[PDB]
């Protein structure tokens, strides 16, 4: 096995400069966003991202949308470390399962992001499929009213991907990004679930896979490879020690006070 310092030295050298990153809920809880009775009036947790429930009752989802609008949460060190990889020309693609939009907020350009469970930044009429900037429904949501299509009256839904829905078109970038990956960084998610779990195996056997996660689970556990590295513990701590090892301490502080 390699160590956190080796990976750090591989990046520091720029021997690694096409980094593919995959992130999940573990990077958001330090911003104070929860992951999980639940006061939202749901029959079960997943009903909040099901289309028939939503058609029957769009209110709980809109309560979450209102809560996740810009200004409730800020990015944390983990997002700002990813922004630094971008600023140093190292980021090939950032794949995110979160819907808090904090990757964009930390100033990572959209062209670098695959928001694989979608985004509140835009919205779509559930009936006639007309697209709308998320601004267009902001006031309705911010007032607890259900936003409606100005042509057909259909409920207008923010472009969060619900159960049973195709992943967004930009997800198709995985077909080129994962063979091109010279390094795979997995932060705050186990990636237990398809198609994300297989993506961990789409990189080239020569390519290190660095997990910064609490425990060691998922396909990094199930089908480990020679050049895997685990850095288990608090994600924030792990990223900070990676940052430390890269020598990016000052750059991190600079970026954090520039942005926040």
């Amino acid at each position: 096995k390699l160590s956190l310092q080796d990976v750090a030295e591989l990046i520091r050298a720029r021997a690694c400069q096409r980094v593919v990153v995959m992130v999940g809920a573990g990077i958001s809880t330090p911003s104070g966003i929860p992951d999980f009775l639940q006061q939202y009036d749901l029959p079960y947790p997943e009903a909040i991202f099901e289309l028939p429930f939503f058609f029957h009752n769009p209110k709980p989802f809109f309560t979450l949308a209102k809560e996740l609008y810009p200004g409730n949460y800020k990015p944390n060190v983990t997002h700002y470390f990813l922004r630094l990889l971008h600023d140093k020309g190292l980021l090939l693609r950032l794949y995110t399962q979160n819907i808090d939009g904090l990757e964009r907020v930390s100033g990572i350009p959209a062209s670098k992001l695959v928001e694989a469970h979608g985004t509140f930044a835009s919205a779509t009429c559930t009936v006639c499929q007309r697209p709308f900037p998320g601004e267009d429904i902001r006031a309705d949501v911010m007032a607890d009213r259900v936003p409606r299509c100005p042509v057909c009256t259909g409920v207008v839904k923010p472009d969060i991907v619900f159960f049973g829905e195709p992943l967004p078109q930009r997800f198709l970038l995985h077909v080129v990004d994962f063979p091109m990956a010279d390094l795979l960084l997995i932060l705050g998610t186990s990636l237990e679930v398809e198609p994300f779990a297989s993506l961990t195996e789409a990189v080239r056997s020569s390519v290190p896979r660095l997990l910064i996660n609490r425990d060691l689970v998922g396909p990094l556990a199930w089908h480990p490879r020679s050049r895997d590295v685990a850095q288990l513990g608090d994600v924030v701590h792990g990223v900070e020690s990676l940052v430390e090892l890269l020598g990016w301490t000052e750059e991190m502080r600079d970026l954090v006070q520039r942005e926040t």
Binding site: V161, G164, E165, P166, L167, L172
Partner: peptide, 5 residues
């Protein structure tokens, strides 16, 4: 098939 889940 890539769908959410």
């Amino acid at each position: 098939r890539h769908k959410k889940x």
